[PDB]
Amino acid sequence: ALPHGHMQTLIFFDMEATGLPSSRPEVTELCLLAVHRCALESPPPPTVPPPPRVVDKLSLCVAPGKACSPAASEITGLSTAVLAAHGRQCFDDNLANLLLAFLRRQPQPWCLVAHNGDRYDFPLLQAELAMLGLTSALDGAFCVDSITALKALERASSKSYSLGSIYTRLYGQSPPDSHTAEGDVLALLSICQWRPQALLRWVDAHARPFGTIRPMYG
């Protein structure tokens, strides 16, 4: 049984932050890539599938309220000072409104899809919203963690489940860009396009209300 019916839009989602959850981190970058279910349900001979022609994309850099750790800066190529030099603004009401306006362009139900999203992206997004007193602003959404999905799908078909490990295993080659939120979204999209009908079936069967994600902090 499908708990919430068929998801109409999959929003591939990735954020960068100042550090890992135990550091009480803040967002430095976010990317949403909204794909209608038809792109996976009814896909139109390369090694890696091309992305769908019709997609919506939002990629934003954000000025966090604290320094990025050296480790974060090495992996993301961002620092708080450099974000500031590019005039980036903090995570504020306008940003929350922009996110909601972007989601409102997508048919519902919406499902956020993020790799280790239950550990990283989903609780951090909830924390940033809570700090604005906008708890529940995005609770119309559903979400799934792609690491859970891809573990289940690999088990059904037949090691590390990092994004890069899965990508290399499936496509016999490393992904293009590992250093930006957009790059991580595009790599995830490619993985999900490997067996797209199976992935979509799994998402529909296991989608969870975003409101069930507790904020990382606050």
Ligand X SMILES: O=C(c1cc(F)cc(F)c1)N(Cc1cccnc1)Cc1cccc(Cl)c1Cl
Q: Does 183 bind ligand X (CB under 6 A)?
A: no
Applying CB under 8 A, does 43 fall inside the site for a copy of itself?
no
- Does residue 128 touch ligand X according to CB under 6 A? no
C-alpha angle 118/112/175, rounded to 5°? 80
Given 4, 36, 86, 179, the catalytic residue? 179
Q: Select from 10, 14, 68, 137 the one that contacts Mg ion (CB under 5 A).
A: 14
CB closer to Mg ion out of 16 and 204: 16
Residue ranges of the annotated binding site for substrate are: 16-17, 120, 184
Q: Which does 61 bind (CB under 5 to 8 A by kind): Mg ion, a copy of itself, ligand X, none?
A: a copy of itself
- Cα–Cα dist 26/63, whole Å: 9
Q: Determine, following the binding rule CB under 6 A, whether residue 120 of this chain makes contact with ligand X.
A: yes
Toward a copy of itself, which CB reaches closer, 66 or 104? 104
Give the number of other Cβ atoms within 10 Å of residue 154's Cβ. Answer: 15
At a CB cut-off of 8 Å and minimum separation 6, what does 154 contact?
none
SS3 readout for 134-174: CCCCCCCCEEEEHHHHHHHHHHHHCCCCCHHHHHHHHHCCC
- Taking CB under 8 A as the criterion, the residue among 53, 155, 159, 160 binding a copy of itself is 53
Residue 115 falls in the annotated catalytic set = no
145 binds Mg ion (CB under 5 A): no
Nearer to Mg ion, 14 or 26 (CB): 14
Sequence-ordered strand ranges (E) for the chain? 9-17, 27-36, 56-61, 110-114, 142-145, 208-209
Rounded to whole angstroms, the Cα distance separating 8 from 111 reads 8
- The reply on whether position 71 binds ligand X by CB under 6 A is yes
Contact 189, 38 (CB under 8 A): no
Stretch that binds a copy of itself, among 35-43, 126-134, 145-153, 168-176 (CB under 8 A): 35-43
80 binds a copy of itself (CB under 8 A): no
Residue 71's DSSP bridge partners are none
Q: Tell me how far apart the alpha carbons of residues 127 and 135 are, in angstroms, rounded to a whole number.
A: 8
User: Which residues of this chain interact with a copy of itself, rule CB under 8 A?
Assistant: 8-9, 36, 38-39, 52-61, 77-78, 82-83, 85-89, 94-95, 97-98, 101-102, 104-107, 179-180, 182
Q: Which residues are catalytic?
A: 179
